[PDB]
Amino acid sequence: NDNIELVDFQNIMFYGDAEVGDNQQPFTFILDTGSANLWVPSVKCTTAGCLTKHLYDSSKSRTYEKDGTKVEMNYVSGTVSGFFSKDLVTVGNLSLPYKFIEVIDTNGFEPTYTASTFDGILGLGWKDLSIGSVDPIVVELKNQNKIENALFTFYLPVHDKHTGFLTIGGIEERFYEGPLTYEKLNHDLYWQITLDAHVGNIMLEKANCIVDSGTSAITVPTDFLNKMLQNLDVIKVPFLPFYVTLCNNSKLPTFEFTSENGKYTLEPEYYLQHIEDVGPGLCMLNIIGLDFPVPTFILGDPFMRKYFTVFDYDNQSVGIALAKKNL
Ligand SMILES: CSC[C@H](NC(=O)Cc1ccccc1)C(=O)N[C@@H](Cc1ccccc1)[C@H](O)C(=O)N1CSC(C)(C)[C@H]1C(=O)N[C@H]1c2ccccc2C[C@H]1O
Ligand SMILES: C[C@H](CCC(=O)NCCC[N+](C)(C)CCCS(=O)(=O)[O-])[C@H]1CC[C@H]2[C@@H]3[C@H](O)C[C@@H]4C[C@H](O)CC[C@]4(C)[C@H]3C[C@H](O)[C@]12C
Ligand code: NA
């Protein structure tokens, strides 16, 4: 199985590296299960954000195949735009020709872009979520028979303790302890499963839960959040949807998620972010209120830091298991 090392960036996000072009041009990616396109910033970039990035130069790649088609990717955090290009993409020791976006304007993706040290985003979603109708990397590698299974695996790094791996094509027992529980997808094209959500006395039955690698938070329905925070001794930051607390706050709850198959819990230690610079013994909650059309939680980074996760295209399932504290 091919492995890609995952490095932590300030306990908000993680990255892994990969190559685009036979020139072996090396890029740092956010690895995002909730999107289905790959992009890298071009040498043709007109914007300030591209200043400090590894830039893609199609003139230095002999496997480059032109495709002028203009495209923009609209994320919740902003927009990047440019054009489609084709070239050899290499993930670990697995290569395949691939269609991706050459980004020339990142101004709509500020301040996220210039803030952090990633170059681009590598989607790990489903095909019907892609622009330009791009087969996902793992399913092509499967199809081309470079890996056993159409699946990938996340063992996330933890700040100041160990590194992580994205593993492609097969499941390695070393990453987790206890049982590995599979949860069927309740949607065709998202890593979305059904779970009862419990926080104290507040309960949502058969809630949609999206396992998502690119979101640095647990997201919660706004009504559910407003009930959770009632008398919690937490304070909202002015103008921003973030809550601050004493790290030691005895009332901070444990999320409990359950299926017929399993039980997954998330204790304060996984969703708190120390902000010692702002004040002594203060923490931010990595919890955001957000309403999808159907009541939904995003089980983001903080969930995935605790739980090893198996994303299975062939079995339309998400495997979940408690991550080992170190390898
Ligand atoms: C096919 S990509 C376009 C997609 N847009 C949508 O789904 C539109 C939408 C919006 C609200 C409800 C329902 C649907 C999208 O941006 N999805 C994102 C996940 C998402 C988040 C909220 C609501 C719906 C989907 C993406 O997978 C991601 O992690 N992204 C886009 S870019 C990113 C890799 C930096 C990261 C990010 O923004 N992360 C930030 C985020 C998002 C929500 C809560 C906290 C935070 C902090 C930070 O981590
Ligand atoms: C996705 C949700 C909800 C968006 C929403 O509720 N938007 C209503 C208006 C919708 N529009 C009319 C504009 C278009 C769609 C209408 S339509 O009906 O067509 O769908 C919004 C609301 C608050 C947003 C976060 C904060 O900012 C702080 C921070 C800023 C960074 O920079 C990026 C990260 C982060 C965490 C943000 C991410 C995300 O962005 C959040 C969660
Ligand atoms: Na995501």
Tab-separated table of N, CA, C and O in Angstrom, residues 112-209:
chain	number	residue	atom	x	y	z
A	112	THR	N	-7.510	32.863	3.841
A	112	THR	CA	-7.087	31.468	4.001
A	112	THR	C	-5.770	31.134	3.244
A	112	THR	O	-4.860	30.524	3.822
A	113	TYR	N	-5.655	31.576	1.991
A	113	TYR	CA	-4.513	31.165	1.142
A	113	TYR	C	-3.142	31.711	1.597
A	113	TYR	O	-2.209	30.941	1.861
A	114	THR	N	-3.037	33.030	1.702
A	114	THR	CA	-1.792	33.674	2.125
A	114	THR	C	-1.474	33.363	3.586
A	114	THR	O	-0.311	33.336	3.958
A	115	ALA	N	-2.493	33.086	4.387
A	115	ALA	CA	-2.295	32.709	5.778
A	115	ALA	C	-1.500	31.430	5.945
A	115	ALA	O	-0.516	31.420	6.682
A	116	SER	N	-1.919	30.365	5.268
A	116	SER	CA	-1.365	29.020	5.490
A	116	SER	C	-0.311	28.635	4.459
A	116	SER	O	-0.141	29.311	3.448
A	117	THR	N	0.380	27.529	4.722
A	117	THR	CA	1.519	27.100	3.890
A	117	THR	C	1.236	26.017	2.834
A	117	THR	O	2.157	25.445	2.304
A	118	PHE	N	-0.021	25.765	2.498
A	118	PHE	CA	-0.365	24.805	1.438
A	118	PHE	C	-0.309	25.500	0.086
A	118	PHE	O	-0.466	26.702	0.003
A	119	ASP	N	-0.069	24.732	-0.970
A	119	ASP	CA	-0.064	25.256	-2.334
A	119	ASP	C	-1.401	25.087	-3.011
A	119	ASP	O	-1.815	25.956	-3.771
A	120	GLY	N	-2.044	23.947	-2.771
A	120	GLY	CA	-3.266	23.577	-3.468
A	120	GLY	C	-4.136	22.605	-2.689
A	120	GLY	O	-3.858	22.273	-1.540
A	121	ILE	N	-5.208	22.157	-3.331
A	121	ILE	CA	-6.151	21.229	-2.728
A	121	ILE	C	-6.255	20.027	-3.629
A	121	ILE	O	-6.348	20.163	-4.845
A	122	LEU	N	-6.233	18.852	-3.024
A	122	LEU	CA	-6.360	17.593	-3.745
A	122	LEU	C	-7.651	16.971	-3.233
A	122	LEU	O	-7.744	16.573	-2.053
A	123	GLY	N	-8.662	16.947	-4.095
A	123	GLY	CA	-9.940	16.343	-3.752
A	123	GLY	C	-9.891	14.822	-3.609
A	123	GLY	O	-9.165	14.154	-4.340
A	124	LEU	N	-10.658	14.296	-2.645
A	124	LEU	CA	-10.819	12.842	-2.418
A	124	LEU	C	-12.322	12.449	-2.268
A	124	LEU	O	-12.684	11.510	-1.527
A	125	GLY	N	-13.179	13.187	-2.982
A	125	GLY	CA	-14.596	12.934	-3.037
A	125	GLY	C	-15.017	12.044	-4.198
A	125	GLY	O	-14.212	11.321	-4.827
A	126	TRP	N	-16.295	12.158	-4.500
A	126	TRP	CA	-16.954	11.370	-5.511
A	126	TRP	C	-17.032	12.160	-6.797
A	126	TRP	O	-16.961	13.394	-6.788
A	127	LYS	N	-17.164	11.422	-7.891
A	127	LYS	CA	-17.014	11.937	-9.245
A	127	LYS	C	-18.070	12.967	-9.592
A	127	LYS	O	-17.786	13.984	-10.207
A	128	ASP	N	-19.302	12.674	-9.232
A	128	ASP	CA	-20.405	13.600	-9.491
A	128	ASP	C	-20.252	14.950	-8.743
A	128	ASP	O	-20.888	15.920	-9.133
A	129	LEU	N	-19.387	15.011	-7.724
A	129	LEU	CA	-19.005	16.288	-7.097
A	129	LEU	C	-17.932	17.112	-7.851
A	129	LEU	O	-17.727	18.290	-7.527
A	130	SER	N	-17.249	16.514	-8.834
A	130	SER	CA	-16.171	17.196	-9.551
A	130	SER	C	-16.755	18.154	-10.583
A	130	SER	O	-17.865	17.933	-11.053
A	131	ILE	N	-16.036	19.243	-10.871
A	131	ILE	CA	-16.230	20.016	-12.105
A	131	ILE	C	-15.357	19.368	-13.185
A	131	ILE	O	-14.259	18.843	-12.909
A	132	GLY	N	-15.868	19.407	-14.414
A	132	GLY	CA	-15.197	18.852	-15.571
A	132	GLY	C	-15.261	17.342	-15.632
A	132	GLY	O	-14.568	16.746	-16.447
A	133	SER	N	-16.066	16.730	-14.762
A	133	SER	CA	-16.317	15.292	-14.754
A	133	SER	C	-15.058	14.417	-14.636
A	133	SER	O	-14.781	13.583	-15.504
A	134	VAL	N	-14.326	14.596	-13.543
A	134	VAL	CA	-13.043	13.930	-13.310
A	134	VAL	C	-13.220	12.712	-12.389
A	134	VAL	O	-13.795	12.806	-11.310
A	135	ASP	N	-12.739	11.558	-12.847
A	135	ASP	CA	-12.768	10.328	-12.058
A	135	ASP	C	-11.856	10.531	-10.874
A	135	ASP	O	-10.793	11.108	-11.038
A	136	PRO	N	-12.272	10.091	-9.676
A	136	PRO	CA	-11.366	10.283	-8.541
A	136	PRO	C	-10.091	9.472	-8.692
A	136	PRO	O	-10.113	8.393	-9.295
A	137	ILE	N	-9.011	9.992	-8.119
A	137	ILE	CA	-7.687	9.402	-8.223
A	137	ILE	C	-7.684	7.963	-7.742
A	137	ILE	O	-7.154	7.087	-8.431
A	138	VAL	N	-8.281	7.706	-6.579
A	138	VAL	CA	-8.271	6.340	-6.045
A	138	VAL	C	-9.049	5.347	-6.931
A	138	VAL	O	-8.570	4.210	-7.135
A	139	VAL	N	-10.185	5.775	-7.502
A	139	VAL	CA	-10.968	4.859	-8.359
A	139	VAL	C	-10.261	4.584	-9.712
A	139	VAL	O	-10.445	3.503	-10.262
A	140	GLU	N	-9.488	5.544	-10.238
A	140	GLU	CA	-8.699	5.308	-11.458
A	140	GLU	C	-7.538	4.366	-11.189
A	140	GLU	O	-7.255	3.497	-12.002
A	141	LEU	N	-6.873	4.551	-10.049
A	141	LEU	CA	-5.757	3.691	-9.661
A	141	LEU	C	-6.191	2.236	-9.455
A	141	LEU	O	-5.479	1.289	-9.861
A	142	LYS	N	-7.351	2.091	-8.824
A	142	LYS	CA	-8.103	0.841	-8.779
A	142	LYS	C	-8.336	0.302	-10.192
A	142	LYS	O	-7.834	-0.767	-10.519
A	143	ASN	N	-9.054	1.058	-11.024
A	143	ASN	CA	-9.376	0.648	-12.404
A	143	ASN	C	-8.152	0.219	-13.216
A	143	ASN	O	-8.160	-0.813	-13.890
A	144	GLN	N	-7.095	1.020	-13.113
A	144	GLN	CA	-5.815	0.730	-13.748
A	144	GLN	C	-5.016	-0.389	-13.043
A	144	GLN	O	-3.962	-0.772	-13.511
A	145	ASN	N	-5.521	-0.889	-11.915
A	145	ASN	CA	-4.961	-2.028	-11.187
A	145	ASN	C	-3.580	-1.755	-10.577
A	145	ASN	O	-2.710	-2.626	-10.549
A	146	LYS	N	-3.402	-0.533	-10.075
A	146	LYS	CA	-2.188	-0.144	-9.350
A	146	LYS	C	-2.366	-0.276	-7.831
A	146	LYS	O	-1.411	-0.108	-7.054
A	147	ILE	N	-3.599	-0.553	-7.413
A	147	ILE	CA	-3.906	-0.803	-6.021
A	147	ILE	C	-4.975	-1.873	-5.950
A	147	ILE	O	-5.847	-1.955	-6.862
A	148	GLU	N	-4.948	-2.634	-4.847
A	148	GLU	CA	-5.914	-3.712	-4.626
A	148	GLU	C	-7.335	-3.139	-4.637
A	148	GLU	O	-8.130	-3.460	-5.522
A	149	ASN	N	-7.614	-2.248	-3.687
A	149	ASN	CA	-8.965	-1.770	-3.413
A	149	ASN	C	-9.170	-0.301	-3.718
A	149	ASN	O	-8.265	0.511	-3.535
A	150	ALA	N	-10.386	0.042	-4.135
A	150	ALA	CA	-10.791	1.432	-4.295
A	150	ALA	C	-11.122	2.017	-2.920
A	150	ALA	O	-12.289	2.237	-2.584
A	151	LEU	N	-10.085	2.245	-2.121
A	151	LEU	CA	-10.256	2.839	-0.807
A	151	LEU	C	-9.000	3.585	-0.378
A	151	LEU	O	-7.885	3.277	-0.845
A	152	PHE	N	-9.205	4.568	0.504
A	152	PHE	CA	-8.121	5.249	1.198
A	152	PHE	C	-8.433	5.416	2.690
A	152	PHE	O	-9.566	5.237	3.143
A	153	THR	N	-7.397	5.788	3.427
A	153	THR	CA	-7.329	5.639	4.873
A	153	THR	C	-6.714	6.922	5.428
A	153	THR	O	-5.807	7.476	4.814
A	154	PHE	N	-7.212	7.392	6.571
A	154	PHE	CA	-6.644	8.551	7.260
A	154	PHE	C	-6.253	8.225	8.696
A	154	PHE	O	-7.100	7.850	9.512
A	155	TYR	N	-4.956	8.347	8.966
A	155	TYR	CA	-4.393	8.311	10.303
A	155	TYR	C	-3.784	9.697	10.461
A	155	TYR	O	-2.719	9.972	9.906
A	156	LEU	N	-4.474	10.584	11.174
A	156	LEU	CA	-4.074	11.982	11.215
A	156	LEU	C	-2.908	12.233	12.165
A	156	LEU	O	-2.828	11.600	13.226
A	157	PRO	N	-2.027	13.206	11.824
A	157	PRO	CA	-0.982	13.578	12.781
A	157	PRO	C	-1.601	14.217	14.017
A	157	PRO	O	-2.734	14.693	13.948
A	158	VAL	N	-0.905	14.191	15.147
A	158	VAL	CA	-1.364	14.955	16.306
A	158	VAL	C	-0.243	15.894	16.712
A	158	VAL	O	0.917	15.480	16.808
A	159	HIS	N	-0.614	17.162	16.901
A	159	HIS	CA	0.300	18.254	17.234
A	159	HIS	C	1.282	17.852	18.353
A	159	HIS	O	0.870	17.352	19.402
A	160	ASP	N	2.578	18.011	18.074
A	160	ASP	CA	3.679	17.734	19.014
A	160	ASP	C	3.797	16.295	19.559
A	160	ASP	O	4.447	16.088	20.594
A	161	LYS	N	3.221	15.302	18.870
A	161	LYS	CA	3.338	13.893	19.310
A	161	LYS	C	3.683	12.877	18.215
A	161	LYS	O	4.526	12.002	18.447
A	162	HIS	N	3.020	12.950	17.056
A	162	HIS	CA	3.392	12.097	15.910
A	162	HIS	C	2.926	12.652	14.563
A	162	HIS	O	2.170	13.621	14.513
A	163	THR	N	3.414	12.040	13.483
A	163	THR	CA	2.976	12.341	12.110
A	163	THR	C	1.800	11.451	11.724
A	163	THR	O	1.383	10.581	12.492
A	164	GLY	N	1.243	11.698	10.547
A	164	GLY	CA	0.121	10.915	10.053
A	164	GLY	C	0.407	10.314	8.703
A	164	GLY	O	1.424	10.631	8.085
A	165	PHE	N	-0.502	9.451	8.258
A	165	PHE	CA	-0.475	8.921	6.900
A	165	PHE	C	-1.848	8.891	6.264
A	165	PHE	O	-2.827	8.513	6.899
A	166	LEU	N	-1.891	9.314	5.006
A	166	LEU	CA	-2.925	8.910	4.073
A	166	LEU	C	-2.412	7.591	3.466
A	166	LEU	O	-1.338	7.594	2.885
A	167	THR	N	-3.150	6.484	3.624
A	167	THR	CA	-2.807	5.187	2.975
A	167	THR	C	-3.825	4.921	1.874
A	167	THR	O	-5.034	4.975	2.119
A	168	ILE	N	-3.328	4.619	0.679
A	168	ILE	CA	-4.175	4.340	-0.476
A	168	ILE	C	-4.175	2.837	-0.799
A	168	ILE	O	-3.124	2.195	-0.797
A	169	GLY	N	-5.366	2.298	-1.066
A	169	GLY	CA	-5.520	0.974	-1.643
A	169	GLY	C	-5.751	-0.187	-0.691
A	169	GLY	O	-6.124	-1.262	-1.140
A	170	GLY	N	-5.530	0.011	0.610
A	170	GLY	CA	-5.678	-1.073	1.583
A	170	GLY	C	-5.502	-0.634	3.024
A	170	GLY	O	-4.840	0.363	3.300
A	171	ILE	N	-6.083	-1.408	3.935
A	171	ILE	CA	-6.214	-1.049	5.344
A	171	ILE	C	-5.117	-1.697	6.177
A	171	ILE	O	-4.976	-2.918	6.169
A	172	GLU	N	-4.365	-0.882	6.910
A	172	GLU	CA	-3.273	-1.361	7.753
A	172	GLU	C	-3.688	-1.328	9.226
A	172	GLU	O	-3.980	-0.264	9.792
A	173	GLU	N	-3.788	-2.523	9.791
A	173	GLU	CA	-4.067	-2.793	11.214
A	173	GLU	C	-3.296	-1.983	12.276
A	173	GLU	O	-3.791	-1.779	13.382
A	174	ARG	N	-2.076	-1.570	11.950
A	174	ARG	CA	-1.222	-0.780	12.861
A	174	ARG	C	-1.777	0.593	13.279
A	174	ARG	O	-1.380	1.141	14.310
A	175	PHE	N	-2.660	1.163	12.466
A	175	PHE	CA	-3.150	2.528	12.705
A	175	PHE	C	-4.157	2.688	13.844
A	175	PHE	O	-4.338	3.811	14.349
A	176	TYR	N	-4.801	1.598	14.259
A	176	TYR	CA	-5.923	1.680	15.198
A	176	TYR	C	-6.022	0.494	16.152
A	176	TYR	O	-5.593	-0.612	15.826
A	177	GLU	N	-6.621	0.740	17.317
A	177	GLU	CA	-6.943	-0.320	18.280
A	177	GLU	C	-8.461	-0.428	18.419
A	177	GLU	O	-9.196	0.492	18.050
A	178	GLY	N	-8.912	-1.564	18.949
A	178	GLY	CA	-10.335	-1.861	19.086
A	178	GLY	C	-10.950	-2.302	17.767
A	178	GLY	O	-10.233	-2.527	16.788
A	179	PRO	N	-12.287	-2.417	17.727
A	179	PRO	CA	-12.974	-2.826	16.506
A	179	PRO	C	-13.020	-1.723	15.448
A	179	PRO	O	-13.095	-0.546	15.793
A	180	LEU	N	-12.969	-2.126	14.181
A	180	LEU	CA	-13.176	-1.247	13.031
A	180	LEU	C	-14.605	-1.450	12.539
A	180	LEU	O	-14.950	-2.537	12.060
A	181	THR	N	-15.419	-0.399	12.662
A	181	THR	CA	-16.851	-0.437	12.352
A	181	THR	C	-17.154	0.299	11.055
A	181	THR	O	-16.835	1.488	10.927
A	182	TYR	N	-17.807	-0.388	10.121
A	182	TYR	CA	-18.217	0.211	8.849
A	182	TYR	C	-19.625	0.778	8.920
A	182	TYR	O	-20.508	0.154	9.498
A	183	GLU	N	-19.809	1.960	8.327
A	183	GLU	CA	-21.082	2.673	8.290
A	183	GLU	C	-21.441	2.944	6.835
A	183	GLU	O	-20.667	3.576	6.129
A	184	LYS	N	-22.598	2.470	6.380
A	184	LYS	CA	-22.981	2.610	4.969
A	184	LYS	C	-23.250	4.065	4.685
A	184	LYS	O	-23.765	4.755	5.539
A	185	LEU	N	-22.944	4.509	3.473
A	185	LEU	CA	-23.244	5.863	3.068
A	185	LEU	C	-24.736	6.028	2.839
A	185	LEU	O	-25.351	5.196	2.229
A	186	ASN	N	-25.312	7.109	3.344
A	186	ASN	CA	-26.741	7.404	3.113
A	186	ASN	C	-26.973	8.319	1.909
A	186	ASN	O	-28.095	8.762	1.663
A	187	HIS	N	-25.892	8.614	1.187
A	187	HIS	CA	-25.924	9.432	-0.014
A	187	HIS	C	-24.993	8.815	-1.061
A	187	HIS	O	-24.011	8.174	-0.703
A	188	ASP	N	-25.296	9.048	-2.333
A	188	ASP	CA	-24.495	8.529	-3.442
A	188	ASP	C	-23.080	9.114	-3.562
A	188	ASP	O	-22.134	8.394	-3.899
A	189	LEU	N	-22.933	10.389	-3.228
A	189	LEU	CA	-21.773	11.163	-3.619
A	189	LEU	C	-21.129	12.026	-2.530
A	189	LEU	O	-20.413	12.957	-2.850
A	190	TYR	N	-21.381	11.715	-1.259
A	190	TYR	CA	-20.710	12.373	-0.120
A	190	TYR	C	-20.359	11.294	0.866
A	190	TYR	O	-21.069	10.287	0.965
A	191	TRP	N	-19.316	11.526	1.644
A	191	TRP	CA	-18.940	10.607	2.717
A	191	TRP	C	-19.825	10.913	3.926
A	191	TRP	O	-19.361	11.417	4.959
A	192	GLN	N	-21.107	10.610	3.761
A	192	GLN	CA	-22.164	11.020	4.678
A	192	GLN	C	-22.848	9.756	5.163
A	192	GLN	O	-23.222	8.903	4.364
A	193	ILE	N	-23.002	9.652	6.476
A	193	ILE	CA	-23.593	8.488	7.133
A	193	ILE	C	-24.673	8.949	8.123
A	193	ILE	O	-24.757	10.134	8.457
A	194	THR	N	-25.490	8.009	8.576
A	194	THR	CA	-26.577	8.298	9.510
A	194	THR	C	-26.160	7.894	10.928
A	194	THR	O	-25.693	6.788	11.159
A	195	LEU	N	-26.283	8.825	11.862
A	195	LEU	CA	-25.958	8.581	13.266
A	195	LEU	C	-26.884	9.408	14.149
A	195	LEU	O	-27.236	10.542	13.795
A	196	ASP	N	-27.271	8.843	15.294
A	196	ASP	CA	-27.945	9.618	16.334
A	196	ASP	C	-26.887	10.457	17.036
A	196	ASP	O	-25.843	9.933	17.443
A	197	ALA	N	-27.155	11.755	17.177
A	197	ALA	CA	-26.232	12.685	17.821
A	197	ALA	C	-26.755	13.074	19.214
A	197	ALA	O	-27.892	13.507	19.348
A	198	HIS	N	-25.910	12.901	20.233
A	198	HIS	CA	-26.243	13.207	21.632
A	198	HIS	C	-25.191	14.140	22.179
A	198	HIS	O	-24.000	13.842	22.064
A	199	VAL	N	-25.628	15.264	22.750
A	199	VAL	CA	-24.770	16.130	23.552
A	199	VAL	C	-25.569	16.454	24.816
A	199	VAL	O	-26.506	17.268	24.775
A	200	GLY	N	-25.227	15.781	25.920
A	200	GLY	CA	-25.961	15.941	27.185
A	200	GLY	C	-27.380	15.440	27.000
A	200	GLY	O	-27.582	14.313	26.561
A	201	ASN	N	-28.360	16.284	27.291
A	201	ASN	CA	-29.765	15.941	27.078
A	201	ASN	C	-30.272	16.303	25.681
A	201	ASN	O	-31.411	15.997	25.350
A	202	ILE	N	-29.450	16.959	24.865
A	202	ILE	CA	-29.872	17.378	23.531
A	202	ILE	C	-29.596	16.213	22.596
A	202	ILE	O	-28.493	15.659	22.600
A	203	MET	N	-30.600	15.840	21.810
A	203	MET	CA	-30.489	14.710	20.908
A	203	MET	C	-31.108	15.017	19.551
A	203	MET	O	-32.184	15.618	19.475
A	204	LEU	N	-30.404	14.602	18.499
A	204	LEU	CA	-30.930	14.549	17.135
A	204	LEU	C	-30.796	13.121	16.619
A	204	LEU	O	-29.689	12.602	16.512
A	205	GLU	N	-31.925	12.508	16.293
A	205	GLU	CA	-31.969	11.129	15.855
A	205	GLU	C	-31.732	11.074	14.347
A	205	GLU	O	-32.190	11.953	13.623
A	206	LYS	N	-31.019	10.047	13.887
A	206	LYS	CA	-30.756	9.818	12.445
A	206	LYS	C	-30.273	11.082	11.724
A	206	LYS	O	-30.785	11.459	10.668
A	207	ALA	N	-29.295	11.739	12.336
A	207	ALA	CA	-28.696	12.941	11.795
A	207	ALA	C	-27.757	12.562	10.658
A	207	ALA	O	-27.080	11.541	10.751
A	208	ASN	N	-27.721	13.358	9.594
A	208	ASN	CA	-26.641	13.246	8.597
A	208	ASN	C	-25.307	13.702	9.167
A	208	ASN	O	-25.216	14.798	9.717
A	209	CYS	N	-24.288	12.848	9.065
A	209	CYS	CA	-22.936	13.154	9.552
A	209	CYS	C	-21.926	12.948	8.430
A	209	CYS	O	-21.777	11.832	7.924
